[model samples]
Target: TLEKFVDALPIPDTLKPVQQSKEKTYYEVTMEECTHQLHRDLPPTRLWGYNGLFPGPTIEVKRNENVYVKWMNNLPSTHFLPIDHTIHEEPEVKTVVHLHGGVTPDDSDGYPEAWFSKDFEQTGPYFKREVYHYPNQQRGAILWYHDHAMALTRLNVYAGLVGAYIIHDPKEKRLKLPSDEYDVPLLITDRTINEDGSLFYPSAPENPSPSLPNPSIVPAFCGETILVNGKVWPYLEVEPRKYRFRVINASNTRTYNLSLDNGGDFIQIGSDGGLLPRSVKLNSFSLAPAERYDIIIDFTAYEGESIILANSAGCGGDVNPETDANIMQFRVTKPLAQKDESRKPKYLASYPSVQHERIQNIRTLKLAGTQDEYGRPVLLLNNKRWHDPVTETPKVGTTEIWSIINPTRGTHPIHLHLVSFRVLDRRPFDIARYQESGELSYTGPAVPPPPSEKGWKDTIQAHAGEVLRIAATFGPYSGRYVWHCHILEHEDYDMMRPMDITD
Candidate 1:
């Protein structure tokens, strides 16, 4: 619809704290309504942003750094995106900021119901305090922040509420994985816009039944266009050397199977949680919503060549090469800045280091839902809504295996809030037999995770009709947290559930 690569990819500016020192770091961020042009020809699209930037500013922190952030909402009383009053007959615009991969405290964990309106004029039932605290006591990895308001997370996030939060560790620095300007964070999101420069989200699915509610929530959403750091099919000029990219899939529902058009391999060193035990050379990988991958792509062999970061994942329908299939371009045209020097080390970290923790319990959860009165789907976690009594209560300091039985017809990127886990295996099961008799019948042998998923992960993709198993220790400092499907639409409907860590 619009021009491609007419704009250069924007490297989000690092967020400078309002106050910083040796002991603590403090910052204040305001959510404002703003308008910015998304492409060369499209007019300025209205958006809700953190600090007035669409993708928000990237906030960098050191491991074990004590940080405080006051997430203030200063937007209008009403939201710009379509709000289904049937779901939230209450406030029209409310927000709560969730650091996607942060090992945060319960109060600062951005509970879905801890919403606030303009200037704190109003607050939800779960609101605790104005300022949120982050201890930054986790490993160095790429994380992100986005809106997590109850019943409106999909709308709020789609309307532009996402940012990058990176943790730097002293040990990781020893590896010297592309420091300084050689390292960059690429936040990928997808959207569909009208010719007049306004974003388009379906109020109802195509040929919706007559009884469907107006402005009903859709089961899934896949935008027709792709954006990297807030630009349409952007391009980046890179030096003829190795560069580190922290790729964050911030899309609402689309999953990208990414590869290079020139058939180059990516040395993946990290995952959603942190660095892998060993680096793996991959020709391509799938990135689901809220998933992050730390990869190194060496362009030294392709000097003076233009290689496209391509996508093969379809959105709603088959991918069109002229559009969604192509992500961004990397032109190795820039002169070498000071004789590029960085090593792509195979060994990154010794995580999940041979722990023989005994599994205390195993829980088999279901990904199932029922249709509403209007025939619209209401996805649920274990067939329970967000307000259902918290059943995923793990004892503090205990290890457990969560077998997510996904009978649904799509893969869900399930995420846990407080701690990271290791994927054990995934096996296909008889969905009809399980649904009919409440019995377990395995149709295939358990398969181990791929090399890319060998490290610690907060989010793991559970494919359809497969039982995805992950072992996690619920500890450190957990009170109340959440686990849900990463797809924004499913999350907003009912796929999220409360998790309490009890002592």
Candidate 2:
């Protein structure tokens, strides 16, 4: 097992474009296997990564810019982890990259069925060309790219096919919160490793007989080891000044309730979609998988003090608190190197409100799960499988309200691709009564979104027994996409739905 070591922080290198023209920028990234020292004490671990580095290089681009990427498939023919042939069907080493929260066209959206295998030996029906074009039309936001193959999404992303994509605009640039070296991206995730320094992932259940052969398929995965920037419990040395941290929860299932050990408050400047309407101060914040929070921590008062970032969320499964609870350490070792000119402005960008009068349709989506033949839980979105025909066909540029009713035991981080939405409100409902009577009845008053969640968001958490309502305008593209649980395991099994925007 990989142990947590508080070594120096490891920031992912920024990827430079191979070719830059006035119209567009071009970059090439290769997927390959490599060895990495996750911890200073542990041996090198064998894992698959982009450009032979864990948590692939970060790509920064200007807002409204056209960026092209040539994603080369240089991976091995056979997968190292266990594959559930019964569910996935296709066991080939194929991959498709989805830019999460990116408002891209249908072809470049990395549709789940648009996967291609090594050397193009095999390809899915909707496989497009090798080069992907991204027209950054949306506002400046923190987006990420990851594997979205039909069934191997969990395995591929868990193996390390993830990176950060930052978009900058004149509005965000004028804010001048933090620039250049001061602004940093921290991609946080978790992984389990074997004694031999190879990745450790259970393919089947612990006690597997003929009846329960494939136990690897489960409700979710919560790794025992926590990783920040591809390092295990790494520490960072910061000057006694203000620094901007773009913290992204890249985990497959774990939800982090992050706070400082000293109980100090940090200012949250941005959310998943982009900068919030105003800065919000928070002593702690909960971040679900695939969620991003841009925060600023001022260390002027705590010079020479070591602040440890900690997590207290009660994630399901056996999680060691002594180790897994601690995320990383920040040592304010040096004094202010230069004048701290960054300021958390009181006003930020504005977003269009979701007016009920403009909503063309309102749909209720029920999230349900049940035990399969082998007693393994199979999750479902609206009680529909992936093969089911697309039922959510919203007209292009039309605003629609979706009321997500989650009756499962776990809280699901629901994500919608291609469009950023505003969280209207969430209300508690009687799950058992609704299921038995087939009637929607509220049990409590509607709770408005928090200040940080008031702006646009591509992903929102729907708690169990609550109705999470959000309004979105299906526009910019008339094509197919997916909205699913951010929990990679649940998504791989069946908890996903195809959404199409028809013109």
Best by TM-score: 1
Which 10 successive residues of model 2 have the least lDDT summed? 348-357
Taking all chains together, each candidate's TM-score versus the true structure is 0.98, 0.97
Worst 10 residues of 1 by lDDT: 82-91
The sequence of per-residue lDDT tens digits that candidate 2 reaches over residues 207-262 is: 56567756367567777788898898988898888888999999988999899999
Query: Model 1: per-residue lDDT, tens digit, 1-503?
Result: 77778888999899989999999899998999999888888889998899999799999999999999999998989877777766644567899999988989898999988999988888988889999999999999999999999999998899999999999998887787888799999999999998888889889888988887888888899898899998889999999999999999999999999999999999999998899999999999999999999999999999999899999988778889899998999999999887766889988788584888999999989999988777778999998988889999999999999999998888999999989999999999999999899787999899999999889999889999999999999988869899999998999888999999998
Best by lDDT: 1
Colliding residue pairs in candidate 1: none
